[PDB]
Design brief:
By secondary structure, the protein is mainly alpha-helical. It is built from three helices and two strands. The chain has helices at 11-22, 43-60, 75-88; strands spanning 8-9, 41-42. Strands 1-2 form a two-stranded antiparallel sheet. Keywords: Signal.
Length: 93
């Protein structure tokens, strides 16, 4: 379903979400840290990491045209940000 986020998100999704981005680099995550020894965090927490990379990737493919990018990011970057969202179970960040 769309237009709705999960009440919470497994910590594993956070570390796994940021990890995937690490392949290309983390702008916000670089200053922030993952989640450990925690039962579970709210979607609001995961969305921060998802949106952080989403906007960041947008700058990476800034040299490329809008047609050569999905929405506002390179198809290559979109796969990274999307891969994390899948683990976080969010679709409205």
């Amino acid at each position: 379903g769309a237009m709705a986020n999960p009440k919470t998100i497994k910590a594993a999704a956070y570390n796994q979400a940021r990890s995937t981005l690490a392949d290309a680099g983390s702008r916000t995550a670089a200053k922030s840290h993952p989640i450990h020894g925690k039962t579970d965090v709210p979607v609001s927490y995961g969305t921060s990491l998802l949106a952080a990379a989403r906007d960041e990737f947008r700058q990476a493919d800034k040299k490329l045209p809008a047609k050569d990018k999905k929405s506002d990011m390179s198809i290559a970057h979109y796969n990274a940000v999307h891969s994390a969202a899948k683990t976080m179970g969010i679709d409205t960040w």
